[PDB]
């Protein structure tokens with residue numbers, strides 16, 4: 141749903157697959173990967189018809205949302221947003237979750253993924269706190285960027301011909317709003333340990349039908365699975381085909397080193413992994429996997445067993461790549 | 468003058484704050500904060516220039532709204548002064564650092580600044596910019612904090628300028644934790660934990676509370692400022708009556724806006740159907756007494772007189788309500 145001069149349709153055939161080449165999509169779409177992928181998912185899940193979303197309204201909002209991801213930020217840009225959307229889209233389709241979620245809950249998870257880093261400045265919450273930024277002042281040092289991402293994502297609905305939720309009922313809007321806020325605030329890394337703990341508890345008390353489909357009894361259960369799902373998608377780089385992962389790693393190091401440069405310039409202690417003069421990119425990816433990504437994904441794999449087995453296997457193959465390339 | 472005479476009672480529960488408002492040219496927050504900072508020797512302890520302090524206070528007080536009947540500068544001054552009294556409760560003697568004392572008092576002063584006179588729920592329900600900015604979570608309390616700290620940036624307003632970097636960071640953290648605890652949606656959880664704190668509390672031989680970690684310390688300051696926020700019905704009846712007038716005027720004005728917007732009118736906000744007596748009794752019964760009873764437990768017997776007044780005031784408001 142954007143001028144492309146190409147196609148693009150061949151690549152988009154993998155939109156239902158892990159390891160869709162999102163960088164290729166960005167190139168082929170004129171750097172509109174978020175609009176393209178979102179538009180394709182909404183058509184495929186029939187969400188326009190279900191929620192009576194005018195298509196030109198959808199594309200107008202997406203283009204505006206995409207414009208508020210910063211082009212000069214190496215990792216937290218429209219491609220990452222497109223990536224987390226598409227990954228969530230795939231996770232939602234997992235067999236163990238078949239017919240578990242409503243169309244509104246599906247819509248919430250996808251919308252949340254799309255806005256979850258919008259207007260990201262390329263620095264961390266802690267950098268913003270430490271430098272007494274207006275944003276950290278606004279949000280009292282609490283989930284500073286995640287609060288902002290939500291505010292922007294919802295505020296953009298008010299731009300001309302941009303309110304994709306105009307035909308939701310008041311109650312639907314309220315519920316969707318609550319769910320999106322819950323999901324995006326859960327992408328705050330400071331909540332990771334708590335989220336994982338609660339995911340492990342969920343796995344332990346897992347209930348499945350005969351077909352091995354999860355049974356969730358209430359909002360707490362459903363929102364918790366959605367929170368962890370989008371958190372998994374946000375943390376999915378190392379579980380992707382290696383060539384994708386390698387580029388994601390290049391981008392986050394570029395973004396991190398730029399923060400470190402800002403810290404160095406202001407005589408601040410340089411943050412962990414943000415010192416380009418003293419970095420161990422490969423070692424850092426292995427620690428990332430060992431202490432953050434594998435624990436999470438092993439637990440997700442548990443919840444949806446064996447739906448996520450190949451992802452766990454790739455994660456292990458990718459861990460070995462970076463291991464084998466430590467100098 | 469007469470103001471200096473009224474301010475002699477600044478260390479006592481039931482200070483006539485309305486009188487101080489009148490006599491100070493409607494600057495109760497400024498004069499009471501100044502008085503308390505002198506009293507506790509805060510300017511000396513924290514190298515705060517008096518011209519700075521006053522400049523900040525006047526700006527802060529200007530940012531309370533004149534046309535808001537309850538949530539204005541008089542309420543701010545009242546919570547400041549009540550917190551100030553509670554801090555000096557015997558059970559808490561030499562428990563808190565001067566920084567923690569500064570944090571509680573500063574928190575109280577800013578805790579409702581720029582209040583628009585309507586509730587969080589109203590702001591959420593009318594899709595306000597404030598609720599949009601803060602994702603429906605502690606909407607006004609986040610706002611109060613942001614504005615309160617932001618005013619420090621004004622010309623000659625930075626009263627913390629001579630705090631060490633660690634001091635400023637610690638103070639900022641404590642003030643945030645305290646003002647967020649004034650969100651009513653956290654009341655039951657705060658109360659629930661306070662009861663458990665009380666159940667397991669430790670005291671020295673001298674009878675003073677022992678609070679070993681930050682979690683316990685801030686928990687007590689959170690509930691202290693929450694009690695001061697909720698202290699109207701524990702005051703002499705002449706004062707309590709005026710507070711009741713004001714909150715009802717404020718609530719009915721919110722109800723008027725809700726009616727004009729075709730919205731369901733919020734509980735106790737309909738000028739046509741509300742009973743002040745029934746409302747205040749319910750307020751004491753389900754919110755104020757359960758909290759103050761727990762506070763009185765914590766510091767027993769320090770708060771018994773406060774609790775007695777509360778129970779008298781309850782018995783009083785319920786006397787004109789027919790009952791079986």
Ligand SMILES: COc1ccc(-c2ccn(CCC(=O)N3C[C@@H](C)O[C@H](C)C3)n2)cc1OC1CCCC1
Nearest residue numbers: 264327328329374375377388389392413424425428
């Ligand atoms: C391909 O590499 C990464 C991809 C993603 C992340 C990562 C960690 C947490 N998230 C979740 C979102 C989040 O909360 N943040 C908060 C902030 C701490 O930085 C993160 C970047 C964003 N994402 C980390 C990656 O690498 C590590 C960072 C230095 C090398 C190891």
Ligand SMILES: COc1ccc(-c2ccn(CCC(=O)N3C[C@@H](C)O[C@H](C)C3)n2)cc1OC1CCCC1
Nearest residue numbers: 586649650651696699710711714715735746747750
């Ligand atoms: C003198 O009367 C009152 C004085 C104070 C309060 C009161 C309740 C909660 N607080 C704590 C601060 C707060 O959180 N809020 C959130 C909002 C719900 O309304 C309150 C206004 C403020 N303060 C209530 C009083 O009574 C109400 C009028 C009808 C009976 C109830």
Ligand SMILES: [Mg+2]
Nearest residue numbers: 150151153154
């Ligand atoms: Mg193919």
Ligand SMILES: [Mg+2]
Nearest residue numbers: 256257285327
């Ligand atoms: Mg983020």
Ligand SMILES: [Mg+2]
Nearest residue numbers: 355356357361
């Ligand atoms: Mg369950």
Ligand SMILES: [Mg+2]
Nearest residue numbers: 578579607649
């Ligand atoms: Mg308040």
Ligand SMILES: [Zn+2]
Nearest residue numbers: 224256257374
């Ligand atoms: Zn992200």
Ligand SMILES: [Zn+2]
Nearest residue numbers: 542578579696
């Ligand atoms: Zn208040």
